[PDB]
Amino acid sequence: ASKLRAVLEKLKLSRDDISTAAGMVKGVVDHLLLRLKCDSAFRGVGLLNTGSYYEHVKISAPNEFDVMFKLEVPRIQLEEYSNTRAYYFVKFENPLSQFLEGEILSASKMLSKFRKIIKEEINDIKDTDVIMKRKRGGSPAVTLLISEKISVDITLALESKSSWPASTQEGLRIQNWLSAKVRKQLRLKPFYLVPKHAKEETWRLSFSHIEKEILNNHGKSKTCCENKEEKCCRKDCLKLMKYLLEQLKERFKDKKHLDKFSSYHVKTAFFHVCTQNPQDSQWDRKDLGLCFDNCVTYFLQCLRTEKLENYFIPEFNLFSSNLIDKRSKEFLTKQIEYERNNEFPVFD
Numbered sequence: 001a002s003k004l005r006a007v008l009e010k011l012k013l014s015r016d017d018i019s020t021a022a023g024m025v026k027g028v029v030d031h032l033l034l035r036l037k038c039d040s041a042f043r044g045v046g047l048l049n050t051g052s053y054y055e056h057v058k059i060s061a062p063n064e065f066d067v068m069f070k071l072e073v074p075r076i077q078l079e080e081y082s083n084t085r086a087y088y089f090v091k092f093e094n095p096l097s098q099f100l101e102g103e104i105l106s107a108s109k110m111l112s113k114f115r116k117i118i119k120e121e122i123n124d125i126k127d128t129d130v131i132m133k134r135k136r137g138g139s140p141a142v143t144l145l146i147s148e149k150i151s152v153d154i155t156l157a158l159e160s161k162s163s164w165p166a167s168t169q170e171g172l173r174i175q176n177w178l179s180a181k182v183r184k185q186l187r188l189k190p191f192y193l194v195p196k197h198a199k200e201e202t203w204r205l206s207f208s209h210i211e212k213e214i215l216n217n218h219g220k221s222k223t224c225c226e227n228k229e230e231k232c233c234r235k236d237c238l239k240l241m242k243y244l245l246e247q248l249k250e251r252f253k254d255k256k257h258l259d260k261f262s263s264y265h266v267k268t269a270f271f272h273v274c275t276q277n278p279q280d281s282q283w284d285r286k287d288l289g290l291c292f293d294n295c296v297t298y299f300l301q302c303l304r305t306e307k308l309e310n311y312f313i314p315e316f317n318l319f320s321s322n323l324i325d326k327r328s329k330e331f332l333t334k335q336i337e338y339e340r341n342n343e344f345p346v347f348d
């Protein structure tokens, strides 16, 4: 578990060292929020987690940021599209009615207005060089580039404060780890709807905001990582799994076999290992190597079986053959199998 500690030490340095990046990013985001709020359709706009203007998907490249803009949408009426469990039609004074196509709220008609208002606030910036990207990928809707290295992903999201949709009833299976009372509390928090297709004007249910709630209070014991006698490697295992996929995606960026894989799959699988191993002793720091291996083993089992269920929506398979093909899965299975059987070269 010595090599892994060095990977983690190098990773701590690029994070902790004086980086102006996030400040160039805040300035941009603040300008857009002041602009969007002036508009009748985008008045109730705000950053998802205000104060922390990021969600660093890239653990290797600290120049690549990801930001979410929430829109508080009251009296939301959802209709599950094609029994998908994760994709819904948004139905419902008239506050957002300019995007309505009868009963159903249009995501594309909202994203186009969002893209255009952002295009109009870009030109007005005199401080730093910011350039937009109109590449098709649904959401992230807008992919800005501040200066030359810094890239920002902006996602528009609908916020609903009503109880979570039925499809989430069996999800968040944290009871035997974080408790039945913590599960009840988190389920009391809002949920989001981000624009995304299943092939249609649909919205995908998002619970990315619950991650920080869990990572900063991840033990079965209330004092996990608060003392010397209670240090676990849950966070370290998440960082290493995230970096392993990242180094592999970079190693094979010329090919297209790893393009569908994201840190989201790595996170989902890691949290399913937390459910499997609910005790703090199954996550002892001394056992960083063994622990990381249960994560590496669980992820390989996911690829092989073509099964990685959404952590909040059990009936939605992120590894569905209709989402990711067997060829893409078999390629990654072989690349990781090589990494574990070669003392993780990708890290050194």
Ligand SMILES: Cc1cc(Cl)c(-c2cc(C(=O)O)c3[nH]cnc3c2)cc1F
Pocket: 205, 206, 207, 208, 209, 210, 211, 212, 214, 264, 267, 268, 271, 311, 312
């Ligand atoms: C325990 C736990 C596990 C996971 Cl996987 C997530 C989570 C969820 C979504 C999502 O869209 O629903 C994410 N989208 C990008 N990163 C994401 C992370 C949140 C959690 F609280």
Ligand SMILES: [Zn+2]
Pocket: 218, 219, 224, 225, 230, 231, 232, 233, 234
């Ligand atoms: Zn801990």
